[PDB]
Amino acid sequence: MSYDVVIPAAGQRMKAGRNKLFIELKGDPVIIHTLRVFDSHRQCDKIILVINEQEREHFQQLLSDYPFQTSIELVAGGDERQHSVYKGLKAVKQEKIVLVHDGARPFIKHEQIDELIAEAEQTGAAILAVPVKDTIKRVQDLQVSETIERSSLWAVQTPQAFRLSLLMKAHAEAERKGFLGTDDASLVEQMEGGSVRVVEGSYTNIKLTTPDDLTSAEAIMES
Amino acid sequence: MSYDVVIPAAGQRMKAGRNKLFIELKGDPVIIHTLRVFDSHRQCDKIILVINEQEREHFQQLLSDYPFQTSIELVAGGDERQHSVYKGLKAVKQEKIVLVHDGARPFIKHEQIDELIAEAEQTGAAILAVPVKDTIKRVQDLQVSETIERSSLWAVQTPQAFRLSLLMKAHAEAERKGFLGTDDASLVEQMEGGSVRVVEGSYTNIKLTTPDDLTSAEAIMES
């Protein structure tokens, strides 16, 4: 059915007003492009944007500049990405499917979200990923220590979709024992019996941090 | 000092004339864009293009359409990438630095090649790579089996630069015992005491296979 989306926007870090999500892409902040995807999606009930308190005013101003039909809440985060995601998930008001999504990934398609909601509802946890295409090596001090075996390796994207109860439990367990995950899926993996499934996404679902990313973004738009 | 470059162009596979390297990028085949990089590079002595015999005529026609100052030889390859690279290295006429390079990586910069020649000459073997930015997971039947620990992982590019004697030895040893490597560095790694170093490259040094790659290419050009 429907979902809430939590987007961590605390910078896991820049000074107030200088969030990487405010970098303009064809004249609109990256975050705007991302927000419009979830706004136009019929099954997205609400957007939870997890922020640093200092940047609240900047986000408020930005949202008044760009109004949306879909409800958007600014929820204060913490000092790490995981802590922030969890404070976000604490603002979901009933049991339902929850997505967690990178603000700087504006090219997610409603098709992919739909497929991810189906899996999360079916089995509890799902992530978007694509096959790794390049050889991967582990390297100590610019010296190759090994070549990682490529056959079944996937590059992980967002969103990641979960039953709220499940992801909440995975966050609580992790926090109670001081485990620091990378992405949300790794918290579920860390639980006993915890299981996560993959929906294959698209190579266009890129994350925009650096200026070369903008250039690649501007070409994905125009196309 | 100077080097030969071997470029495997046997399709490790398409029918004759339909090589992926003939896909036109702003009106010139991808291979042309790549060849121009090595042609304009003062230290490149020779280009060895390893082909399927069937496509010889197509390559010959393509080269007469685009003349180059730098000498280019068409050398017949084998049925795998490794076998083809090795037949290529067999046409290098004296001991020197040899590069091996993907035909479909046209955005290599002379700066990067220069840094790679320095390392290969210094320590014997060098590769271009960039830090992995995304979470990597191993996945069986769309089901995550593990999260690969990210801190020291690099995505490997070409070229890879070696002392000819060293890479030749690594190829001979591998063939004598039927070992099938992925890239050339993995053949050197497989030798006793074999050691390979990393030069950090650039995120623009992309490989062009799919149509989305073209679009990303056309934007890297224009920029």
Numbering used by the authors:
A (entry chain A), B (entry chain A): 1 to 12, 15 to 225
Question: What's the paper's own text on this?
Answer:
The core of the enzyme consisted of a seven β-sheets (β2, β1, β4, β9, β5, β8, β10) where all strands were parallel, apart from β8 and β2.
Two crystal structures of BsIspD have been determined in orthorhombic crystal form with space group P212121 and P21212, named apo form I and II, respectively. In the structure of apo form II, although the residues 13 and 14 were not built, it was clear that the P-loop shifted upward from the active site, since the Cα atoms of Gly11, Gln12 and Arg15 shifted 4.5 Å, 5.8 Å and 2.1 Å, respectively, meanwhile, the side chain of Arg15 flipped to extend to Asp81 which moved about 3 Å. Therefore, the active site was more exposed to the solvent than that in the apo form I. Moreover, the L1-loop also rotated about 30° and moved about 3.0 Å. Here the residues of Gly11 and Gln12 were too far to interact with residues at the same time, only one hydrogen bond was formed bewteen Arg15 and Asp81 (Arg15 NH1-Asp81 OD1 = 3.3 Å). The structural difference of the P-loop in the two apo forms may imply that the P-loop was quite flexible.
